[PDB]
Each structure stands twice: as C-alpha cells, then as structure tokens.
Design an enzyme around this catalytic site. Structure first.
Site, mmCIF file in Angstrom:
data_model
loop_
_atom_site.group_PDB
_atom_site.id
_atom_site.type_symbol
_atom_site.label_atom_id
_atom_site.label_comp_id
_atom_site.label_asym_id
_atom_site.label_seq_id
_atom_site.Cartn_x
_atom_site.Cartn_y
_atom_site.Cartn_z
ATOM 1 N N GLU A 23 58.029 42.820 122.273
ATOM 2 C CA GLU A 23 58.641 41.704 123.043
ATOM 3 C C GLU A 23 58.785 40.573 122.347
ATOM 4 O O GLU A 23 57.965 40.564 121.197
ATOM 5 C CB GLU A 23 57.892 41.431 124.354
ATOM 6 N N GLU A 351 53.486 46.128 134.048
ATOM 7 C CA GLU A 351 52.180 45.648 134.419
ATOM 8 C C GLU A 351 52.361 45.412 135.971
ATOM 9 O O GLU A 351 51.730 44.245 136.403
ATOM 10 C CB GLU A 351 51.583 44.910 133.516
#
Ligand SMILES: *[C@@H]1O[C@H](CO)[C@@H](O[C@@H]2O[C@H](CO)[C@@H](O[C@@H]3O[C@H](CO)[C@@H](O)[C@H](O)[C@@H]3O)[C@H](O)[C@H]2NC(C)=O)[C@H](O)[C@H]1NC(C)=O
Ligand SMILES: *[C@@H]1O[C@H](CO)[C@@H](O[C@@H]2O[C@H](CO)[C@@H](O)[C@H](O)[C@H]2NC(C)=O)[C@H](O)[C@H]1NC(C)=O
Ligand SMILES: *[C@@H]1O[C@H](CO)[C@@H](O[C@@H]2O[C@H](CO)[C@@H](O)[C@H](O)[C@H]2NC(C)=O)[C@H](O)[C@H]1NC(C)=O
Ligand SMILES: *[C@@H]1O[C@H](CO)[C@@H](O[C@@H]2O[C@H](CO)[C@@H](O)[C@H](O)[C@H]2NC(C)=O)[C@H](O)[C@H]1NC(C)=O
Ligand code: CL
Length: 627
Positions: A23, A351
């Site tokens: 990321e 998540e």
C-alpha cells in the site's frame, strides 16, 4: 536433534506461497517505488491560497508564488495551478524550486526528463528563455536546460526538457528549479500545472518505477503482489476511498486523493503501472476491491451497495475482461494492452474485522455479484476466520498478525491444528514489530522496532517454516509493510527502507529472500520441531531437478545441533550449499550501517547423513540434490 527426511512428498507447495504486500504507506508509492522526483507535483487535493498548498515548493529570489483554483485549469482533474509572478524592477535569476521527497539524487550517469504545463493568463510581450534544472540546496547548479517562451502563449502548453548533470551531487540535498530572467520577466505572471521530473526507470517503463527499489523487490523472488491495500484502499470516507478509474489514463486526468497515512497520493502509480510491474517481474496480483467501509467508521447500508459493486466489477474487467465486452476492458486495450492480465485472487475489503457488524451483508452482496461475473476468481474474506459466519462460505481468509519475535517461534504450529476442508489461508500481513508484549504498537523507547532485527527475522523464519509445512492450506504469505521512506515514516518496522539516494535491505528482507528463492514444488515431511521451541525447519524439493532445500530457523539464544538422515533416498549429492543469516540478537541494518547483517554462502559436505550446528539467532538454507 536427529531429523529424518521422508522421500515421499505429502503435498504440492503452492507457486504463490511467498510474495509482497503493498500500500502507499511511509511514502512507499509517491516518494518510493513510483519514480517521480517532485513532491506535490500537480497541487492535488490541497486548499488554494494556503501554505500547505505550496508544500515542497519555494521561491527563488523575489518570486511571488500562490496555488490558485485556476479559472481555466489544465484539466478537469487538476483544478489547481501555481501562479508565479515576478515583481516590477526585478533582475537576475527569479523562479522557484521543488525540494523533492526529502531530497533528489543527482547522478551524472542518469538523464532526467523534466516537464511542466504553462500558460500566460494575460497575453504579454514577454520573450525569453524558461530554464529548468537541478541545483544543490546552496544554489550550485548541477544541470540545466532551457527553451524560448512567449507571453502571447495564453493556451496551456507542455514543455519537455532533458537534464544532464555536469557532476553527481555529494548528497541528496538538491532541488529541481524553474527560472526566468528577472529583468526580462519583470511584471509577468505565468500559471503552471502538472510538473514532472523522472530519472531513468525500471525496464525504461514510461511512467515507471524507481530502479533500485524495484530491483530489490524482484531480488526477493516474489510470486504475488497484494495491492492497493491495506488501509490505503479504504479512505477516511466513502468519497476518499481508492478508485481504480481515477488511477488510469493520462496524468492530466488523475485527480489524486487524500490517502490514509497523512499525505496526498498522486495516483501516478495507478492500476496499469501496477499490472505492468507484475508482468516485468513474473508476479501475479492479489487485488483488493473496496467493500463499503471507510476508516472514519461509516459502513454503506445494504441498500446503498449496488454502484460500488459495479465499480468493483469494472475494476476487475479492466484487468481481465474481453475488450469487446466492456468499457473498462476496451480502455485497457486503448492504453496499449489488449491481452488480459492474470488475476486469480480478489480480496473483498481490508481488515473488515473492524466492521464485523456490516461485513456479513457487504461480503454476501459483493461476492454473490462478483462470483457470478468471474466464476474462476477466488474471493478472500477479511474478517477473523469463521467469526462472524459468512455467506457464501469463503474459499479463503486473509489472516494478519503483528506480534513479538518470541510469539512468532512460539506459534509456528498455528496452522497444524486447522481442518483441511477446502479453505485456504493467506497470511497477508505479518511482522514481529516489538519486544514488548504489553504494548506492541507503542514507541521505540517502549520496545517497538525501528528496523527489523536478527531476533525479529529469525522469529519470523520459524513461523514461516510452519507456513511452508502447512502449505496444503496456506497458499500465500507476505510481510508488512514492505517499504519505508526513512524521512516520512508512519509505521515501523518495514521490510526495505530507503532515502532519496539508496536502499537498506533489512534482516527480515533476507529471511524473506532465503525462503522464497530456495523453495521446491514438493513438501517433504520430516521429524517435527518441538511445538513452543526455538528451533524449526521445513524441507522442500524441486521435482524437475532434485534440488532439496532444508530451511532452518534458530530463533533462540542457544546454538543447536541438527543431524539430517536422508537414508530413504537412492542418492544424495556429496556437497551442498549453505546460506546463513545471523548476527547479534538486536542487530539491524540501518541507514548508517546498511550492510551490518548480510547472508554468507559456503560449501558443506553432505550425503545420507550430515550434522549442522545452527547458531543462536540464525536463518540457514542447506541445498543438496536428492534422487
Ligand atoms: C470513477 O468511476 C466512478 C463510478 O464507478 C465515478 O463515481 C460516480 O460519479 C458520478 C458523477 O459524479 C456519481 O453520480 C453523481 O451522484 C451525485 C450524488 O448523489 C448526483 O448529485 C449527481 O448528478 C451524479 O449522479 C456517482 O454516484 C459516482 N459513483 C460512485 C460509485 O461513486 C467517479 O466519478 C469516477 N472517477 C473519475 C475521476 O472519473
Ligand atoms: C534539452 O532538452 C531537449 C528536449 O529533451 C533535448 O533535445 C532532445 O535531445 C534528445 C536526445 O538527443 C533527442 O532525441 C530529441 O529529439 C531532442 N529534442 C529536441 C526538441 O531537440 C536537449 O538535448 C537538451 N539539452 C540539454 C543541454 O540538456
Ligand atoms: C473448516 O473447518 C473450520 C474448523 O472446524 C470450520 O470452522 C468453524 O466454523 C463454524 C461456522 O461455520 C464456527 O462457529 C466455528 O467456531 C469454526 N471453528 C473454528 C475452530 O474456528 C469451518 O466452518 C470449516 N469450513 C468448511 C468449508 O467446512
Ligand atoms: C533523512 O533521514 C536520514 C536517515 O536517518 C537523515 O540522515 C541522517 O541524519 C542524522 C540526524 O541528523 C545523522 O546523525 C545521520 O548520520 C544521517 N544518516 C545518514 C545515513 O545520512 C537525513 O538527515 C534525513 N533527511 C532530511 C531532509 O530530514
Ligand atoms: Cl520477544
């Protein structure tokens, strides 16, 4: 300990076992893997007429700078311009600089490509040279080139100039500059937009990647790349999420976005540049799609999901779709890639254990629609495995763990007790981040690791021997985070660090590389390690060659002897190679000592019986040939 090696494999080792998690965090994209050298290049997502809009930009001499909402902007996506004015009665060199991402490496062996757009907002009689270049932060000019401009140029016009330094700088404290003659320019106003400075890129890709960092990632022999996050997928709000279509096409047409780690993302490192990097390195994507949750805590309602599900279908179509059958696939074709890319794995959110109340409905609606469109893709669930219960039943879960080095060797049997029921597991983020079990996500003073240590890499390696033993159900595993700009850190430790000039390969990078490069297609069962112990091993073999890879992690403070027994084989080579990563428990590679801990290769005697002493805090690979 005597370790008996079985010749008969128990399972095929997945081609995807070892890979990378990316990321844009710690300026891993902008400032990092993406090769662009100017910070805040296009004034994306800043407030006009504020100091923050001018971040990384500085006047030369008496230049007047402002970032304006341009009445006639360079594009719909780039509403802001740099307004440059030269006062009446000026002289000499007037202009502005860009400090880069905490510097710019100026190397005389490199040609740089500078570009910008400009217009005169009011026609003028101005006639003279616009000069771009590189200078040390004392103003010592190292490279310069110029072209003639006229104040009668009131339409947006791109300038493209190459820069050739006369000397390499002694450090990275350098800046890009744009100047005009102060007397010739006195009283003029120029509007600028969409600046760019590139060095030579990885594989000479247009709009490509920074060579040292991309080569370091390739060196690790990864099989997959999980992207684009991670928290940076999610946004703070629906409106600030990552969006695939804002990342494709001309740089003029990419609006950027506020990312999830304190800074603006250009989205110059966009979907097509990610896929081009996978092609260049032999990686396959594990691609995430936004799933109706953002980090400010808002879940979309069930009755709001449809347009966002369609966007996720459009994002996958860009990657794999037939160009005759969808607009996003025709767009991939139009951008020079008519052939689909490989995509076998899609992760639904990031998540979603943070939004477990909504994920059941978000997962259900996203995967029902996406599985119907893409019957060959395997969809990964992000909640904790089996809690809450999802429908449809996930074929795969992404498991994340950040813990102490000790937890990692103590939990090397994490997957041994799992049922084999058709579910596969992705360890999509793991790292030993701290020595303080009481405060894992705290400060360095409170035990957080600034950089990976021998202790943390060897704990990891013990856990990774379990991943390999359990690779019947573990299909993929990545350390996180991958990259770190040492001048703009939001999370430590990281696998690979860098400044504007050079790269630091961590101890954990070397553990990752020794596991990944030395991996057969056959898992060969062996005497089990002690569950809870410091000493762990995993053995694989290449069916085509008989190369047999004995990976050994001693995550403890005591040296330990192993005797290998390969009596079940017909032949074992009379020599093997040894690769060992070891050092003091708390040793790290740092910017000041970047090669403190590096692996050592040697030749050892082997055969149907041999003895190795695994030093305290070591990762070792013994390669032999078996038939
Ligand atoms: C990338 O693609 C997405 C769609 O997958 C684009 O988002 C869509 O943008 C349109 C036009 O802005 C949105 O419609 C507008 O909605 C507002 C609010 O109710 C309404 O006031 C307007 O008349 C208009 O209908 C649409 O909701 C939005 N869709 C999603 C899923 O966000 C996006 O703009 C594209 N990005 C770029 C840079 O092109
Ligand atoms: C200034 O930049 C121009 C444009 O990049 C350079 O001229 C180019 O040089 C390349 C490499 O030889 C040629 O392929 C291009 O055709 C040239 N373009 C033009 C428009 O001339 C020029 O060499 C640079 N000068 C300096 C002093 O760095
Ligand atoms: C694969 O095996 C696991 C382990 O038994 C199953 O997980 C259970 O799932 C139920 C709900 O379906 C939960 O209430 C349990 O707590 C889970 N057990 C554990 C230990 O986590 C899983 O359902 C099985 N999957 C399939 C496809 O059969
Ligand atoms: C970027 O980070 C580097 C690495 O920490 C900084 O360079 C260090 O600066 C410290 C503190 O002044 C010195 O003690 C070190 O010896 C330097 N190390 C190296 C390897 O150069 C650097 O100053 C930072 N850059 C900026 C602009 O902040
Ligand atoms: Cl510990």
């Amino acid at each position: 300990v005597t370790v008996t090696v079985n010749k008969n494999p128990s399972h095929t080792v997945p081609s995807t076992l070892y890979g990378l998690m990316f990321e844009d965090i710690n300026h891993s994209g902008d400032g990092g893997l993406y090769a662009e050298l100017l910070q805040n290049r296009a004034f994306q997502q800043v407030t006009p007429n504020t100091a923050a809009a001018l971040a990384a930009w500085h006047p030369i001499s008496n230049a007047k700078l402002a970032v304006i909402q341009d009445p006639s902007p360079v594009s719909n996506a780039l509403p802001n311009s740099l307004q440059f004015s030269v006062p009446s009665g000026s002289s000499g060199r007037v202009g502005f600089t860009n400090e880069g991402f905490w510097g710019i490496k100026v190397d005389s062996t490199w040609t740089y490509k500078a570009s910008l757009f400009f217009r005169f907002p009011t026609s003028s009689s101005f006639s003279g040279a616009l000069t771009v270049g590189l200078q040390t932060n004392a103003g010592r000019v190292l490279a310069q080139n110029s072209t003639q401009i006229r104040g009668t140029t009131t339409k947006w016009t791109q300038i493209n100039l190459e820069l050739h330094p006369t000397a390499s700088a002694p450090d990275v404290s350098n800046s890009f500059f744009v100047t005009i003659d102060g007397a010739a320019g006195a009283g003029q106003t120029i509007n600028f937009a969409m600046f760019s400075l590139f060095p030579p890129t990885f594989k000479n890709r247009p709009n490509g990647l920074r060579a040292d960092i991309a080569e370091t990632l390739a060196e690790m022999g990864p099989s997959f790349f999980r992207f684009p996050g991670g928290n940076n997928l999610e946004g703070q709000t629906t409106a600030t999420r990552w969006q695939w279509n804002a990342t494709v096409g001309s740089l003029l047409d990419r609006p950027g976005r506020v990312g999830d780690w304190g800074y603006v993302n250009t989205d110059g490192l966009g979907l097509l540049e990610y896929l081009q990097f996978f092609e260049d390195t032999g990686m396959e994507p594990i691609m995430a799609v936004w799933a109706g949750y953002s980090l400010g805590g808002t879940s979309l309602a069930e009755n709001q999901l449809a347009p966002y599900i369609q966007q996720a279908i459009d994002q996958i179509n860009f990657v794999i779709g037939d160009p005759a059958k969808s607009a996003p696939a025709a767009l991939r074709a139009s951008l020079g890639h008519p052939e689909p890319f490989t995509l076998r794995f899609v992760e639904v959110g990031n998540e979603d254990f943070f939004a477990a109340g909504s994920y059941p409905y978000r997962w259900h609606d996203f995967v029902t629609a996406l599985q119907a469109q893409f019957p060959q893709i395997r969809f990964i669930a992000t909640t904790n495995a089996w809690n809450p219960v999802l429908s449809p039943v996930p074929q795969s879960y992404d498991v994340h763990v950040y813990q102490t080095p000790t937890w990692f060797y103590q939990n090397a049997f994490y997957y041994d007790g799992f049922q084999r029921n058709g579910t596969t597991y992705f360890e999509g983020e793991y790292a030993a981040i701290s020595t303080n079990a009481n405060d894992l996500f705290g400060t360095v003073a409170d035990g957080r690791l600034a950089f990976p240590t021998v202790q943390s890499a060897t704990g990891e390696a013990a856990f990774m021997t379990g991943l390999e033993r359990n690779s019947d159900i573990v299909f993929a595993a990545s350390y996180a985070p991958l990259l770190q700009h040492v001048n703009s850190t939001q999370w430590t430790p990281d696998l690979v660090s860098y400044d504007a000039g050079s790269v630091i390969k961590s101890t954990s990078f070397f553990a990752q590389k020794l596991f990944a490069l030395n991996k057969g297609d056959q898992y060969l069962p062996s005497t089990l390690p002690t569950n809870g112990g410091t000493l762990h091993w995993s053995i694989t073999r290449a069916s085509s060659s008989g190369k047999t890879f004995i990976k050994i992690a001693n995550a403890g403070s005591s040296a330990q002897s192993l005797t290998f027994q390969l009596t079940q084989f017909n032949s074992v080579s009379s020599t093997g190679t040894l690769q060992v990563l070891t050092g003091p428990e708390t040793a790290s590679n740092t910017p000041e000592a970047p090669q403190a801990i590096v692996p050592k290769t040697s030749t050892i005697g082997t055969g149907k019986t041999f003895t190795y002493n695994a030093p305290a805090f070591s990762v070792s690979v013994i390669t032999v040939t078996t038939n």
